[PDB]
C-alpha cells in the first residue's frame, strides 16, 4: 500500500558541494544492557577500547521503545515515536531513511543480525546487504562456530565511499552483538577475558557468574567493533565530516527473578530489557556537540539525531530531544 508521509516538509539546509560531505555510521546494537557498561558504573571494564578514544560521549539514561528486534528496530527509525508507534503498519510509513534518501543522502544497511525489519523495504534492494553470509562477510572463520563477525561489515566499505565520492552517506551496521542464549559464541577467543564461561544452551543450568562472564565477553567484542568502526571513519576524516552513533535495540534479562532473554511485552517487561547503552562519537572538526551524558533519552531521539547530522529539518520531530545539541560554538 501507499507510503504515508510524515516529513513532506523536510529540507536539507546545506549540500555537500558547498561544505564537507558527511559520513556517518549508525551501529544498531543487539541485546546490550546499559548497566553492564563500564561508563555507567559497571565494575568491570567492558569498554576498554572506547575508553581510549577522544570524543566519545556515553549516555547513561537511555530507554528502548521495546524489548525485541522486530518491535524496536522499526520504531528506532520512525517518525511516530514510541507513544504512537504501531509495529503492524510501520512498514508503510515514511521513515527517517526514506527522508534522507530522497534528499540525496546515500544509504547503506549491512546486516549481521537478521534484516532491517521493514526499514529498508522502500529503498533500492542493492542498498541492503546480508552480512550473515560467509560470501559477503570475510570474517567467519576466526572461531570454531564458523560464526560471522560484526567487524566483517567494515570490509569493503571503502568501495561504497568511492562509489559515492563526495556525497553525504549514512551507513547502518546491524550487529549480532550480545544476542543469546549462546553468549559464548558471540566473540572470538581473544575476548574470552572473564572466565569461566557458560557454554551450555540452558541458561538457568549454568552457574550464574559463568553466564555473566560470557555476556561480558560478548560486550568486549562489541567495544572492539565500535572502536574499529570509529577507526574506519577516521581514515576518511580529511574529506568527510565523520560521526558514529551506537544504540542497542533493547537490553536483556540475566536471571533476575528467574527471567532470561528478552522479548517480554512492554507492560510487564523488567527494566533490564529496556535500559540500553548509547554512544556518540564525532571528529573534532565537525562542529557537532553532544547532549549532556545524563539527558533523559529514548529511542525517539534517534530520528532527530540522524536528521540533524545531515542538516535536515522536519516539522514532525521539531520538539524532540536528540543526542546532539541545536546550538553551535563558532
Binding site as annotated, residues for Zn(2+): 30, 69, 249-250
Which of positions 4-33 make contact with Zn ion (CB under 5 A)?
Answer: 30
Q: Which residues are annotated as a binding site?
A: 30, 69, 249-250
Q: Please identify which residue in 69, 106, 112, 175 interacts with Zn ion, judged by CB under 5 A.
A: 69
> Residue 178: CA atoms inside 13 Å, Cβ hemisphere, count?
36
- Residue closer to Zn ion, measured from CB, 172 or 233: 172
**249 contributes a contact to Zn ion by CB under 5 A:** yes
Q: Which residue is nearest to Zn ion (CB)?
A: 69
Are 73 and 109 contacting, i.e. CB atoms less than 8 angstroms apart? Answer: no
**272 contributes a contact to Zn ion by CB under 5 A:** no
Nearest to 310 by CA among 107, 154, 138, 124: 107
Least distance to Zn ion, CB of residue 195, Å = 26
Least distance to Zn ion, CB of residue 120, Å = 17
- Residue closer to Zn ion, measured from CB, 136 or 175: 175
Cα–Cα distance for residue pair 51/313, rounded to 1 Å: 33
**Number of residues in contact with Zn ion, rule: CB under 5 A?**
3
Least distance to Zn ion, CB of residue 326, Å = 31
**64 contributes a contact to Zn ion by CB under 5 A:** no
- Residue closer to Zn ion, measured from CB, 150 or 249: 249
**241 contributes a contact to Zn ion by CB under 5 A:** no
Least distance to Zn ion, CB of residue 103, Å = 29
Q: Give me the residues that bind Zn ion (CB under 5 A), please.
A: 30, 69, 249
Amino acid at each position: 500500500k501507499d507510503t504515508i508521509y510524515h516529513a513532506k516538509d523536510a529540507v536539507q539546509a546545506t549540500k555537500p558541494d558547498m561544505r564537507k560531505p558527511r559520513l556517518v555510521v549508525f551501529v544498531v546494537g543487539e541485546t546490550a544492557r546499559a548497566d553492564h557498561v563500564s561508563f555507567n558504573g559497571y565494575e568491570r571494564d567492558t569498554f576498554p577500547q572506547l575508553a581510549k578514544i577522544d570524543g566519545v560521549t556515553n549516555f547513561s539514561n537511555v530507554t528502548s521503545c521495546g524489548t525485541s528486534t522486530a518491535y524496536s528496530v522499526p520504531c528506532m527509525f520512525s517518525y511516530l515515536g514510541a507513544d504512537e508507534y504501531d509495529v503492524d503498519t510501520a512498514k508503510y510509513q515514511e521513515n527517517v531513511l526514506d527522508t534522507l534518501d530522497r534528499l540525496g543522502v546515500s544509504i547503506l544497511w549491512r546486516d549481521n543480525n537478521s534484516d532491517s525489519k521493514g526499514v529498508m523495504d522502500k529503498l533500492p534492494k542493492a542498498q541492503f546487504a546480508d552480512y550473515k553470509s560467509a560470501t559477503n562477510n570475510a570474517i567467519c572463520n576466526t572461531n570454531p562456530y564458523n560464526e560471522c563477525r560484526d567487524v566483517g561489515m567494515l570490509v569493503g566499505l571503502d568501495d561504497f565511499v568511492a562509489a559515492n565520492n563526495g556525497k553525504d552517506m549514512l551507513i547502518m551496521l546491524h550487529q549480532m552483538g550480545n544476542h543469546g542464549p549462546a553468549y559464548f559464541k558471540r566473540y572470538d577467543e581473544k575476548f574470552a577475558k572473564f572466565t569461566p564461561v557458560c557454554e551450555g544452551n540452558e541458561l538457568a543450568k549454568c552457574e550464574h557468574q559463568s553466564l555473566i562472564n560470557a555476556y561480558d565477553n560478548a560486550l568486549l567484542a562489541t567495544d572492539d567493533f565500535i572502536a574499529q568502526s570509529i577507526q574506519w571513519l577516521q581514515t576518511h576524516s580529511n574529506a568527510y565530516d565523520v560521526s558514529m552513533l551506537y544504540v542497542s535495540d533493547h537490553g536483556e534479562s540475566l536471571g533476575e527473578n528467574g527471567v532470561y532473554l528478552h522479548g517480554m511485552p512492554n507492560a510487564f517487561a523488567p527494566k533490564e530489557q529496556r535500559s540500553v547503552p548509547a554512544f556518540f562519537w564525532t571528529d573534532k572538526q565537525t562542529g557537532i556537540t553532544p547532549m549532556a551524558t545524563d539527558t533523559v533519552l529514548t529511542h525517539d531521539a534517534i530520528t532527530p539525531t540522524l536528521l540533524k547530522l545531515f542538516d535536515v529539518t522536519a516539522d514532525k520531530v521539531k520538539d524532540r530531544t536528540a543526542f546532539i545539541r541545536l546550538e553551535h560554538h563558532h
